[PDB]
Each structure stands twice: as structure tokens, then as C-alpha cells.
Write a protein that binds this DNA or RNA. Structure first.
Ligand SMILES: [Mg+2]
Ligand SMILES: [Mg+2]
Ligand SMILES: [Mg+2]
Ligand SMILES: [Mg+2]
Ligand SMILES: [Mg+2]
Ligand SMILES: [Mg+2]
Lengths: 638, 673
DNA sequence: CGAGGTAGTAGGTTGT
DNA sequence: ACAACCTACTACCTCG
DNA sequence: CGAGGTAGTAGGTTGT
DNA sequence: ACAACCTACTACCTCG
């Protein structure tokens, strides 16, 4: 729309497949005893590896770039205690057409195993799977950091090796955990063994094993090396040069040749139009300019630092904000403490009885247990809450404004909105999350084309990442109803955003329900990884980049700051619907600017998805049982 | 303090253990390979069985009632085992640990000496000895379930309870070769794994691509499964651990798992019948095993006071409140939704409600929802308006629905804050019990207190906890009766959890909500709360909650309420009646809460007072009386005290419908009954 | 708990 | 088993 | 979906 | 493994 430009992907064209490689050998797999219908795939994958060479599962049997005579055609196989005896039978050679994508897939699996194999046969280089660390970045008392790249290798439809590369660093420890704290570093929150890779959370016995304290090795993180301060984010120009360097080094050293940089047509997307009361360039400006929509609100202060009132500068800033919005503000103070037990809960009930909408909490940094308990208790009285750490100087503007912003989203005000005009006037995001054996499936939405309302819905408990079909529809029905309650009508079109892959048929019911109500839709999968890197052929790297790729599949570079490192574009698939890709790309990129609780940095994900993700993250942390009396317009979880 | 009486338990006293038994033999175990620390206690269990004799696990090794020299001391199962005599260890039955091992021995002795009999069908600690009923292909056997352990006087105790067993003696092919329909469940003829049967398939066994390459027939044949059988026809069965994959199988390799639905034959016994039958079998067992003549054990039982149910006047059952008036009626509005295409309230339902509310001096408005679900969202809008006009609960007249549609409808109405009561619609006025219950359910769902107790209890707040739901995660939930009279029933939003254990913060939070409702209703904190747990109280589950109650100055009692494990109770003389309190140890007692002659032999609840200073008699009194508060069953009282029965029904429905619907539903409205 | 992404360190689910 | 995605955490740097 | 317990059938979690 | 508890289904029979 705003400029047809051109970019380099972090892929590289390498040599064509030789006519052998285009004609892999085929072996059929014979097992004794034959495996149960649930152990097939993990077993074929195993035989494929045991046979050695460059071999991959191809259907119900195997395909290899190695002639069968230099393969381990007979052997045995251990899985979950059971023992299977395999034998491979060569069945001639099937040529594969790289154009046909079915056949291209298997060629690409071969390609991947080749790279992995030829990587082993190198030195003196640290390799783990398809990653290789060919240099040293940093060292110290018992630790070193290696530099290298994670690689991948497949086959293009023109029949050539494509090679994906991305510079990466690796943290390696050189001491026993005793030998580690032979110098002053505390207990790492994770420890690994040198006798197995099986780590955990952290005298008679270990005797007979011939294996407590000198047997393991610490799993080193950045928290363990804060005290030593080098960083491992690369500026995008350095990352691109080191990408090319490494893509050539692998070209020769593995005999694949000259790395031809891969190029793609990108498009510059129109700039989004953020509005407070008037136009702003960042959500924090709404504190000076005024909010997009603002009603009469009452905030209350809760101090845990033993201090007395509203900090004056917070008070003024607040009146300035509400002054510019021409909305009436009243500031309350909770004169109570969580240590009074239920007396506290009474105090909260009365605050809310008197119109308080959210609570600002000044406190020293809290233990998560106390932090969580506090939040959850205020939630049970219908009060969302924003915490602001209490050694606080006015000079720390970015910290308190962001708190202020969060507090207001929590009280239910729309601080900013978009002023364009879009194909969908309801955009809803779905994530799953939660740090247990079950998860919460959940959803948040922007209602109105301007994004003039942000609501969450009560999540639902679920076994895995898949959201049950009726759940997907129900949460979606709640967002339509929110639209109905604000616009007095149904939306003509809904933009449905799912975090990650859309598991097979997950939205079948919902889509069918939309048709019946005559609501158009677009389902888009939004992938946070798998997009790779994008570099400008010439000039500078900027946001709003849209890269069409396959059909119904595109990259989208939504955020970039030339101080955070190389950005990582989202990868998006249009799963259902008939809106032109460019239009989805436009609306999603704009939705990225709608987030109210970050004053100075837009989120990589569009607002509905980012909110959804925070929502399920918080429910999973506090529990769902607290949320009955909390208004959906109040974004409690930001 | 009401008067005592004596009962017979279904236990029996047998002979004292002899000098030899009190001093079992100890053997240490060597295994090659060594056991992987997680897989070692099941292993010692295996060696103990393969050793032979009466031999069990005892901590690190084994204890035997056979001398080592007549045990299979060396063998293959970790695979190779060898056992080493390490002398004999005296055991003191007064020591609960040592008693625990004597008892493990006794069970093994029982199973072993049961094995050596003939001709009697034996499964674990059960024995079937006669033939109740048969049919071409199937037979139901009649025997009893037993257990045997050691008292602390050092003598055997036999427990006996009559039981029937349903057996299929035919393959699924031979079964269907009789005319018998499709058994809803089936089992492999080669292992104990069972499948849900979906249908038959036209397909050919010879040619059916099983994942991997094999077909159906060769796959089973390559395992020797058809060695001695016939493949039969293609069967389609269902995921044990998924929900998007029917699976091919072979009729000739399958056996039906027979249930009542697959067959005129009541298997419940009238209490006097079970009583004698128990005594026969006990005298028979004790004779055959050379354990002496069984003296049935007797226990002191105490009869509790008849609970006084209060409608607006006193009643003997909740349904009478429909004639006499409710405990506490408010101005209420109900709407009608007809899925039968008919219109208006059946006059007899209109009358009954009018009679009930007139007796209660409270006004009633009846609405009709002129909307239907197949309108889609316009139907939600109709609901939203109805809530807006004050409708509190909706009666739904409909043909028997499928669970999917039932569930969706109840959830939708829930999303507009409207509890519903379904009443199936071929409905004659003379079906008084069904529609009166429906009416009782409707009113509860609208938030009325239909009945309440009059009496004096230690706790003026009683809360029940349970976990349920049918997945890899469950809901931990709580329901409660507030006030001495329990004239306020409430639920709380349940919380998802991994298994049976409710997290400590959850327990407290749920408990806090019920304190909060008490505060809202009574203007103060409660003086004492009665905490009822369904099943056992997992170690420390209430630690945090109890600590919190203490800090707030609220007294408490924790009681574990166990639906099984309490055995049977019979009168020494006279008819058997409920309201029986039978203390066993300090802090543990039996409680017969409900019984009806026509409803077979009652199973009393087993209770354990886990914390609190309240006397057992008192707890028993309140718990027994709490059993009578339940408003949605007009003609028979639930076995559980109302707070737990409510909690159980709560978490069932939340599991069934999902918690996402509950946000706008008032906690006074008992939507799940 | 200020927030954002990019970096690193773990790990888990979907599904062929 | 393994590809191709997701979850959680801390440190770094700067403030569309 | 009428409700209750006791029957039968299947399965599971908690703790040693 | 095993002991001692829990969940779900449906048949039966009657209506504190
Ligand atoms: Mg996700
Ligand atoms: Mg997430
Ligand atoms: Mg926040
Ligand atoms: Mg339970
Ligand atoms: Mg239950
Ligand atoms: Mg009901």
C-alpha cells in the first residue's frame, strides 16, 4: 500500500539435487512383533534412525539417500520396555518430483537428516541437532558462551537445497555444582547430570551405580551470570552479516556450494492512526491529551508501605488526564490492611459499594504468593488492581505512567483507539495457557472498527492446547454479545485470531454458527515463531512490513526498534474466509497499536491476542474462582 | 440423649492367631536386574505371589506363614528372583504397623484357601457359590465379597457381604448369534482391556489398511490371536484415550462385558434376606478354612431424634411445602419455554404453583417465552429481556433430549443468568411425583427456601466439599447451608484442579465465600462452622483453612464423610430404621442416614472426626439432620447431608456444562439440582 | 510488581 | 520419534 | 430430562 | 501392587 519494497529472507539457495538424490531408495519395514496402532509412528521414526545413513520415514516404510547395503538393515529396537526386531527390505528406487509438494515433503526430510548427519562429522565444533557453535563469545570462572547458528535444510520446488540460518548463542558450564560454588555463585534453579541429560528442579545409593553433590552440573542461565554484563541480542545488521558468513561456511564445509540469498517482495503497510481524545503517537500521550472515551471514575489507593496519602505527582497527573478528558475523577483511599483478615474484605466491599472501580497498590516488591493472594482477594470483591513498587521517585516517569495506564484500563476506560476503517468491526483473539497439567482456553476482543472497547470473557478449563469446539463458539458468542450490547446490532464481519496453529477443526462449530447468523468471518492463525528473519535488500528495516510468501500464508513484521535486536516477524495463515491477505495484514498490524497498558512500546501481537494471552496467563496463576463479580470491560489482567 | 440398642455388624470374630502365625518368617529379596526404585513395591508384590504360600510384602522384604523350604525361593518374574531366609519376626497386633502385616497375611490366607475349593467361581476376595439366574450365553452367580484381617486381640475378623456376578461365556459373534443386541461394552479375548462398541462395519478383515501397512486380520494373526479362534466380522470400537478415532476390531476376538442394560431380575436384597445370607456364608467360610465358628460382632448403637422439617408449617417431606407453603417465599417470577410446539402453562401446573404461593403469602408472575432456540441469537435476546423483566428461573417442557442439546440449552440459559428445570412432556396430571419434583426443582432454582430445619446444632454454618467432573482435570467445589436452621442454601464458583485433592488456597477461598454469605445474611461472623469433606480428607488439605478460621476466632469441626467402607448394620432384634449412630473408635463412627424397606439393604456412611472438639454424638446429630434439608427431592431424603449432596451435584454440572456459563448466576439459585 | 521485544535457560502438545 | 508450533522464567536496554 | 438408594458394570486417585 | 477410598453409566421400584 505505502511502498512496494524488497527483502532478503534468512534462507539461501544452494546446489540442485543430484540425479541420485532425486531418486531415493525405498525400503519396507518388517517388525516382530508388529506394533500397536499407537506405536507405529514413533517406531518407524526409530528404525529410520537405527538404519543409519540418511534415512527418513516415508509413508508406511522408509526412504533413503544411502544404498541399502551400507545400512543397518537388520537389528533390534527398544521402546517403553518392549523389544522389537526389525528387518528392512529394499524395494528399488522411487524418483520424487520436487514440484509435487507431497513428494517434496519427503525430499525435505532427507535434506534435514543430511544436514544433521554431515554436522556430526565436523570438529572442533559444538553441535546439537541442527545447531552448531563455531566460535567463542564470552568466558569466565567456570563458564563460556559459544556463538553459532541454528540451521534447517529442505528442498525447493525448483529442486534445490534451501538452507535456513539464524545466529544463536549457547551457555556452557565447566564445573561440578560443588566445583561451581567453589567460587561464589548460588544454587542454580536447574541442574543437569553428566551421566544423563535428565535434569530436575533441585551416600549409600550412588555407590552400587558407580555414577548428591559432585555428580551433577548446573544448568546455567542469565540469572546465574548477572554477576560477572554482555548481551546476546544482535543488532540486525550484524545478524545479517553473520547469517551470510555462516551460510557460506556451511556451503563449502558440507559441499553444497554457493549460498544464494533468497529474496521476496515486501509491502509497506499504512501507518495506523492512534487516538486519545485527539491524535497521539503512543498510548502514554493520552495522559496529556486526554482519553478516547472516559466516564466518571473513582479510584482508590492502598498503601502497604505504611505511608499516608496519594503521592502528589500521581494525583496531579491523574487530574490532568481527567481534566483533558473532561471527566470527573474522585480519588479514594483504603485505610485498611490485609493483616486485619476479613476486616480487610469488608473495607473492600464498602469501597466498591461507594463506586470505586479499581485499586492502585503502593508496596515494596512482593513475594508472588502474597502478590497473587492480594490480587485474587480484591478480585473477589470486584476490584481489579494495579501494583506500583514503593521506593518511587517522580523522575521514574515511564514506570508510574505505565502503572497509571494499567490502572485506567483496569477501571474500564478506553485510553486509545484506531481511526482507520477495517474489514471487520469485531476482532477476537483466542489463546490457551496456564502452568499445570490442564489449561484455560480463553478469549478477548476489540469491539467496533475503531477498537473502541476491549472486553475479556470468563475462560474454560481444558486438558491441552486444543480448545473444545463448543468452547470456541461460546466464547465467541460472548464477544458477539458484547458487540450487540454496545452497538445495538450484530457486526457484519468478525476477525478471528488464534494464537499459534489452529488445531484441526477447532473452529468448525463456531464457523458454522457464524454462517447461520449471517456474520462473515476470517480465521487467521498467528504464529510467534517459524517466520524466520527478514532483512531489507537496501536501506533500513521498518515495521508494517508484509511479505506474501506461499498462498494464504504471509509474514508480518509488526514491531521493531533499532535498539532491541533483530526483530522476528510473525507468520500468519489465512485458514478460513475470503478477505484479501493485504487487508488482513493491514488490520492485524493496526490492532498491534491498540494495547492501552504499554505507553511507549507496542506489542508484537495484535491487541486481542495479547490481551487473551495475558488473561489466560493470569487465570492460570490466580485461579478462575475469583472472577464472578469483575466487569468484563475492566482489563484486570494487564 | 436418646437410648441405646445393639446392632450386628457384618463382621465376624474367628479363631485367635496361633503362636506360629504371630511369628512369621522373614525373607530378603535379591533381584537381577536391580529394580528402578519407582518400580519396586509392585515388584515385591510379584515375588510374594510367585514365591507361593501365604506370603506378603513387609517393608523391604517378605513375611511368610509358610516355611522358606516349601516356597519357590528362586525363579523368574526385573526378571530373576532369589529369596533368603532371615529368621522369624514376632508381631504384636497392638502395634498398628505390625498388625498391618498380619492382616496382609490373613487376606492372602483367605485368597489361597479360597483357591483350593471346588466347585466355586472365585475372583480375588470374592466367592460365588450358586446360580441366581442364567440365559442362553450369560449367567449371574450369587456369592459374597469377603475380607479377612487381624484384630488387636490377635484374632481373625471375617467380613462378608452377599454379591452377584454377571458373566458372559460367549464370544461377541456367538453372542450376536442369539439375537441379543449390541452390548455397549466389549473386551479383548486376549487381555483385560475393554472397548466401547460403536457399530459393525461392512469392511473386509483381509483388506483393511491398519496404520503401518498391515491389515486387520494379519495383524492379529501375526500375534497368534487367531491361533485357536475365528476372526469373525469387522467391529468398530471407540477410543479409550481420545475422542476422534473409531478403531477396527474383530468380532471373533471380542467378548461382551455384560451390564443390566444388556438383558425381570433385581439384585438388591431386602435387609432381612441379606442378613441371614451373610450369616450362612460366614458359618460356611469359617468351617471350610478351619478358622472356627464365627461370632457375629455386636456394637452399641444410639438412635437419633427425628429431625423436624419446616415448610411454612411443619412437614414430613419437602413436597408437602407445595400444599402448606414454603419456609421463605419472596415475590417471584417464572417463565415457561415449550419445545413441544404447544402453548401455555398446563392448568394443573398453574394451580399447584398458585396454591403453593398463596399458602406462603407471596406473589407469583408467570411468563411464557415466545421464543425458540432455533432462532439462534434472537433467542438469547428473548432470554435477556426475560431476565430484565424479573424472570428468575425457567420451566422447560420438552421431549426427552439428547445430552448434547440438553447441555447446550441449560448452558445458554445460564449465560443469561437463568437456571432452568426440564420436565419431559408426554405428561399426564396423574404423574404427581414427577411434576412435583420438577416444581420443587424449579423453585429451588429460583432461589426460594422451600424447607428448613427446626432444632439446635453446634454449627450455624455447614459447608460441603467434593471433587468431580469427567476428565484429566476435575472441579473442586463447595456448597453450604447458612444459619442454624439451614434456611439458606448457596453454591460457590468451583475451581479446576488436577485430581481429587483440592489445593489448600482453594479450600480456604471457597470456605471464605461461605463465611461471606453468612456475614451478608446474618450481619456477623458465624460462631462455629461444620466442614464436611466427601471421601477422605487428603493429608493437610484443610491446614490453611483451619489456621484461617482460628485467627478469625471461628470454631470448627472437620468431618470426613465416606460413602463406602462402613459395611453393613443390622438390628439385633426388631425392624431396621435410620437415624442410627454407631461409634467405633474415638473420632470414627457409623451413621445410617436413610433406609426404605423396598429399597434393599442400606449402606451406612463411615465418618471420621478429623479436627474440632465437638462430641461425636453432636456431629452425628447435625449431619443426620442435614440429610433432610435437600429441597429438590420431594419424597426421599438423600443419603448425604444436604451441603455435600449439593456440592456433588454442583461439580457434576460444572463438569458437564463447563464453568464459563456461571458468571451471571446468583449463588442462592440452585441451578444444578 | 512497568512495559515492550529480543536474547538465553528449561519444558510441553498436536499429529503424522 | 519428531517436526512445528506453544508454555514458563531472568537479564538487557530503553522508553513509537 | 424427577427423585432417591441400592444393585449391577466400567473406570480412577491417594499413599505406602 | 495394594489398600481404601472416589467417579460414571443404567435397571429396578416406589414415592419419609
Ligand atoms: Mg498459545
Ligand atoms: Mg499464552
Ligand atoms: Mg500490569
Ligand atoms: Mg468425591
Ligand atoms: Mg461425587
Ligand atoms: Mg433437577
Amino acid at each position: 500500500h505505502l511502498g512496494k519494497t524488497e527483502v532478503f529472507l534468512n534462507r539461501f539457495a544452494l546446489r540442485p539435487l543430484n540425479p541420485e538424490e532425486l531418486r531415493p531408495w525405498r525400503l519396507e519395514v518388517v517388525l516382530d512383533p508388529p506394533p500397536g496402532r499407537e506405536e507405529v509412528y514413533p517406531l518407524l521414526a526409530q528404525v529410520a534412525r537405527r538404519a543409519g545413513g540418511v534415512t527418513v520415514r516415508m509413508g508406511d516404510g522408509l526412504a533413503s539417500w544411502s544404498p541399502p547395503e551400507v545400512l543397518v538393515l537388520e537389528g533390534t529396537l527398544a521402546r517403553m520396555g518392549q523389544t522389537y526386531a526389525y528387518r528392512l527390505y529394499p524395494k528399488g528406487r522411487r524418483p520424487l518430483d520436487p514440484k509435487d509438494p507431497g513428494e517434496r515433503s519427503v525430499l525435505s526430510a532427507l535434506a534435514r537428516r543430511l544436514l544433521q548427519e554431515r554436522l556430526r562429522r565436523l570438529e572442533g565444533v559444538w553441535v546439537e541437532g541442527l545447531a552448531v557453535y563455531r566460535r567463542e563469545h564470552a568466558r569466565g570462572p567456570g563458564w563460556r558462551v559459544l556463538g553459532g547458528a541454528v540451521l534447517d535444510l529442505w528442498v525447493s520446488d525448483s529442486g534445490a537445497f534451501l538452507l535456513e540460518v539464524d545466529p544463536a548463542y549457547r551457555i556452557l558450564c565447566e564445573m561440578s555444582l560443588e566445583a561451581w560454588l567453589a567460587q561464589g555463585h548460588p544454587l542454580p534453579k536447574r541442574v543437569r547430570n553428566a551421566y544423563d541429560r535428565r535434569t530436575w528442579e533441585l551416600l549409600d545409593y550412588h555407590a552400587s551405580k558407580g555414577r548428591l553433590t559432585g555428580l551433577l552440573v548446573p544448568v546455567l542461565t542469565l540469572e546465574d551470570l548477572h554477576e560477572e554484563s554482555l548481551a546476546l541480542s544482535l543488532p540486525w545488521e550484524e545478524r545479517r552479516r553473520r547469517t551470510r558468513e555462516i551460510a557460506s561456511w556451511i556451503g563449502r564445509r558440507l559441499g553444497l556450494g554457493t549460498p544464494e540469498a533468497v529474496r521476496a517482495q515486501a509491502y509497506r503497510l499504512s501507518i495506523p492512526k492512534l487516538m486519545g481524545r485527539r491524535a497521539v503517537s503512543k498510548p502514554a500521550d493520552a495522559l496529556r491529551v486526554g482519553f478516547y472515551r472516559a466516564q466518571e471514575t473513582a479510584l482508590a489507593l492502598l498503601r502497604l508501605d505504611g505511608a499516608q496519602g496519594w503521592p502528589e505527582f500521581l494525583r496531579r497527573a491523574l487530574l490532568r488526564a481527567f481534566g483533558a478528558s473532561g471527566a470527573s475523577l474522585r480519588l479514594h483511599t483504603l485505610h485498611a490492611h490485609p493483616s486485619q483478615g476479613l476486616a480487610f474484605r469488608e473495607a473492600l466491599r464498602k469501597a466498591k459499594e461507594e463506586g470505586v472501580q479499581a485499586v492502585l497498590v503502593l508496596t515494596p516488591p512482593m513475594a508472588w504468593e502474597d502478590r497473587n493472594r492480594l490480587k485474587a482477594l480484591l478480585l473477589r470483591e470486584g476490584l481489579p488492581s494495579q501494583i506500583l513498587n514503593v521506593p518511587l521517585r517522580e523522575e521514574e516517569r515511564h514506570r508510574w505512567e505505565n502503572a497509571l495506564l494499567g490502572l485506567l484500563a483496569k477501571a474500564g476506560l478506553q485510553v486509545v483507539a484506531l481511526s482507520g476503517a477495517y474489514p471487520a468491526e469485531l476482532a477476537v483473539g483466542f489463546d490457551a495457557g496456564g502452568r499445570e497439567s490442564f489449561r484455560f482456553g480463553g478469549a478477548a476482543c476489540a469491539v467496533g472498527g475503531d477498537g473502541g472497547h476491549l472486553l475479556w470473557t470468563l475462560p474454560e478449563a481444558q486438558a491441552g492446547e486444543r480448545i473444545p469446539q463448543e468452547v470456541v463458539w461460546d466464547l465467541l458468542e460472548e464477544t458477539l454479545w458484547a458487540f450487540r450490547r454496545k452497538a445495538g446490532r450484530l457486526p457484519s464481519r468478525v476477525l478471528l485470531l488464534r494464537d499459534g496453529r489452529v488445531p484441526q477443526d477447532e473452529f468448525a462449530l463456531a464457523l458454522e454458527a457464524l454462517a447461520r447468523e449471517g456474520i462473515a468471518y476470517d480465521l487467521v492463525s498467528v504464529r510467534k515463531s517459524g517466520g524466520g528473519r527478514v532483512y531489507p535488500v537496501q536501506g533500513r528495516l521498518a515495521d508494517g512490513l508484509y511479505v506474501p510468501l506461499e498462498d494464504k500464508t504471509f509474514l508480518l513484521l509488526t514491531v521493531h526498534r533499532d535498539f532491541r535486536g533483530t526483530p522476528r516477524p510473525l507468520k500468519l495463515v489465512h485458514e478460513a474466509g475470503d478477505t484479501p491477505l493485504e487487508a488482513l495484514a493491514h488490520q492485524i498490524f493496526h490492532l498491534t497499536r491498540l494495547y492501552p497498558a504499554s505507553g511507549f512500546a507496542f506489542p508484537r501481537l495484535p491487541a486481542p491476542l495479547h490481551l487473551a494471552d495475558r488473561l489466560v496467563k493470569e487465570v492460570g496463576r490466580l485461579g478462575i474462582r475469583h472472577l464472578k463479580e469483575v466487569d468484563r470491560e475492566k482489563l484486570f489482567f494487564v
